[PDB]
Amino acid sequence: AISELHGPRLLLRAWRDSDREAFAEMCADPQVMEFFPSVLDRAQSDALVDRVQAHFAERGYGPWALELPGEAAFIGFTGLFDVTMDVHFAPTVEIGWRLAPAYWGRGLAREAAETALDFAFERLRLPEVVAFTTPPNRRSWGLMERLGMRRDPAEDFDHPLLAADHPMRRHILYRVDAARWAER
Ligand SMILES: CC(C)(COP(=O)(O)OP(=O)(O)OC[C@H]1O[C@@H](n2cnc3c(N)ncnc32)[C@H](O)[C@@H]1OP(=O)(O)O)[C@@H](O)C(=O)NCCC(=O)NCCS
C-alpha cells in the first residue's frame, strides 16, 4: 500500500510492469546515462526496477515513478534511497532523479524533488536528506543547489562501490536539513 504524492503537474507513484519498457529506453539513452559508467540493457534496467520495488516494500518510500496526468504515463523517477554503503555521511537518506530528455528544461525534476523533500521532512520527519553526483554532471548538482541543498567541497569523496583508480570515482556531496528546507 505505497502512498502516492501529488505536485501541480506530477504524480509520484509506485512502479508498474508497463513502466519497464519506457525506463529501459531511458537507460539505453547515452544522453540520460552520460555521467554513469555505461548505458544499461533491458536485463540491467529491470534489475534496477527490482531494487526500487524492494526498497518500497521494505521502507514504504523510494525513487517514485513520475506520471504526468494529461500528458504521459512515465517520464522517469525522482525520490528517496537510504544510504547504507561505507561513506563518511552514512547512515542517511539520499534524493536522486532521472528524466526522459523530452521532459528536460520544464522544472519537472525540480517539482518532483520539492514533492519528495516535502514528504521527507513533513511526513517521514527525516533530520537530513543528501544528494551526490560527479563534478561534470552540472544539470544534476545545478538542481541540488537550486533546491537549496548546499555543498562543502571538503566532503568530496571516492565512491566505495567503484574501483580505487576508477575515472568517475570522485563525487561531490550536497546536504539539506529540516531547518534549511523549512526556511526556504
Ligand atoms: C538531472 C536532471 C533530472 C535535471 O533535469 P532538468 O529538467 O534540467 O531540471 P529542472 O527540473 O530543475 O529544470 C531546470 C530547467 O528548466 C527551467 N525551469 C525550472 N523551473 C521551471 C518552471 N517552473 N517552468 C519552466 N521552466 C522551468 C530552468 O530554467 C532550467 O533550464 P536550463 O537547465 O536550460 O537552465 C536531468 O538532466 C537528467 O535526468 N539527467 C540525466 C540523469 C542524471 O544524470 N541524473 C542525476 C544522477 S546524479
Author numbering: 9 to 192
Could you share sentences copied from the article?
Enzymes in the Gcn5-related N-acetyltransferase (GNAT) superfamily are widespread and critically involved in multiple cellular processes ranging from antibiotic resistance to histone modification. Previously, we determined the structure of the PA3944 GNAT enzyme from Pseudomonas aeruginosa and found that it could acetylate polymyxin antibiotics, specifically the 3-Dab residue on polymyxin B and on colistin. The canonical chemical mechanism attributed to GNATs is a general acid/base mechanism; however, mounting evidence has cast doubt on the applicability of this mechanism to all GNATs. This study shows that the Pseudomonas aeruginosa PA3944 enzyme uses a nucleophilic serine residue and a hybrid ping-pong mechanism for catalysis instead of a general acid/base mechanism.
Since our kinetic studies showed the enzyme utilized a ping-pong or hybrid ping-pong mechanism, we attempted to obtain a crystal structure of the protein with S148 acetylated. All of our previous structures of the enzyme were determined in the presence of CoA. In addition to adding AcCoA for co-crystallization, we also included (R)-3-(2-chloroacetamido)-4-(((S)-1-methoxy-1-oxo-3-phenylpropan-2-yl)amino)-4-oxobutanoic acid. While this compound was present in the crystallization solution, it was not observed in the crystal structure; the rationale and synthesis of this compound as an alternate substrate will be described in a separate manuscript. However, we did observe a very small amount of AcCoA cleavage in the presence of the enzyme and absence of acceptor substrates in our kinetic assays, possibly indicating the enzyme could form an acyl-enzyme intermediate required for a kinetic mechanism with a ping-pong component. Further studies are necessary to show the acyl-enzyme intermediate is indeed formed but are beyond the scope of this current study. Therefore, we first docked NANMO into the WT structure with AcCoA to determine which residues might interact with the protonated and free base forms of the molecule.
